[PDB]
Design a protein around this ligand. Structure first.
Ligand SMILES: CCOc1ccc(C(F)(F)F)cc1CSc1ccsc1C(=O)NS(=O)(=O)c1ccccc1
Length: 282
């Protein structure tokens, strides 16, 4: 879809509301991928059967984040984690989009952080919301934890009201800093919406990874809806800033080819537009 100059984008959005066109646009975004050369064999192999939080959320073979293989006595495949490399604005493979780890893949998660040279992590969920398990806690409550070969240490936590920042050290104990930005304002009643600190959150995250040679981890629960919502906002604040145009429709359609369901629902989709409208007005 077309590259909307900032100036025109407010009316562009107002239209689609008044128009009501958001629904159709999103149906096109959904049917655009239509499995085209796209497989998920690793995700469905029996060794990996327990590594998938949701059974219908899969990591497509071509973009999936490969782990190094290790030979265990059990013989089972060790190359697998439910996450995919996802492009950014002038930047192939800027993001890793990942499901939130399980108790049983927290070591795999860290080892991914390790092997793919990650320094920053973006967490867009609580462990629990409306009394449903979303994500299992994969960093140490207090001080240090070993996750197999991987030693993680909590060196500080800046708890703000809309979000928390946790700086660890990551070590491989068979012979680095990782900063986690974890948004925490998840309403118990209603659905998400409000701009200022969401943008701030994204702005401070965009800053902290602005120099990071590696990709950044984005993870929610399944690692598709919110994770996607963020990937887009992030990239579009970039493109906005480097060309003063904004291409949500075309950029999302692009990344749906790299991970299933990125930006999961219409509300998120809209959310993105409304939020960006606001971001500008300054
Ligand atoms: C209130 C705090 O909300 C946010 C904070 C930070 C971000 C960020 F990081 F910029 F992406 C985005 C959001 C927006 S998430 C959103 C927006 C409209 S519906 C929705 C959402 O997550 N509905 S869900 O939890 O029902 C859901 C969740 C996942 C899949 C399907 C559905």
């Amino acid at each position: 879809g077309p590259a909307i100059p900032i100036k025109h984008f407010p009316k562009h959005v107002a239209d689609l509301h008044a128009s009501s066109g958001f629904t159709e646009e999103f149906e096109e975004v959904q049917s655009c991928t239509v499995d085209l050369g796209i497989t998920a064999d690793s995700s469905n192999h029996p060794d990996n059967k327990h590594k998938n939080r949701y059974i219908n959320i899969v990591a497509y073979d071509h973009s999936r984040v490969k782990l190094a293989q290790l030979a265990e006595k059990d013989g089972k495949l060790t190359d697998y984690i439910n996450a995919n490399y996802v492009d950014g604005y002038n930047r192939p493979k800027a993001y890793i989009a990942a499901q939130g780890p399980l108790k049983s893949t927290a070591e795999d998660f860290w080892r991914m952080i390790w092997e793919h040279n990650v320094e920053v992590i973006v967490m867009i969920t609580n462990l629990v919301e409306k009394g449903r398990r979303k994500c299992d806690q994969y960093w140490p409550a207090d001080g240090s934890e070993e996750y197999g070969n991987f030693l993680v240490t909590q060196k500080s936590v800046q708890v703000l009201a809309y979000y928390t920042v946790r700086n660890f050290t990551l070590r491989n104990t068979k012979i680095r800093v990782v900063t986690q930005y974890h948004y925490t304002q998840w309403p118990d009643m209603g659905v998400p919406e409000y701009s200022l600190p969401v943008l701030t959150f994204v702005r401070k995250a965009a800053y902290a990874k602005r120099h990071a040679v590696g990709p950044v981890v984005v993870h929610c629960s399944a690692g598709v809806g919110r994770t996607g919502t963020y990937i887009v906002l992030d990239s579009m604040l970039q493109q906005i800033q480097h060309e003063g145009t904004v291409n949500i429709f075309g950029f999302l359609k692009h990344i749906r080819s790299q991970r299933n369901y990125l930006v999961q629902t219409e509300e998120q989709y809209v959310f993105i537009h409304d939020t960006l409208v606001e971001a500008i007005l300054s």
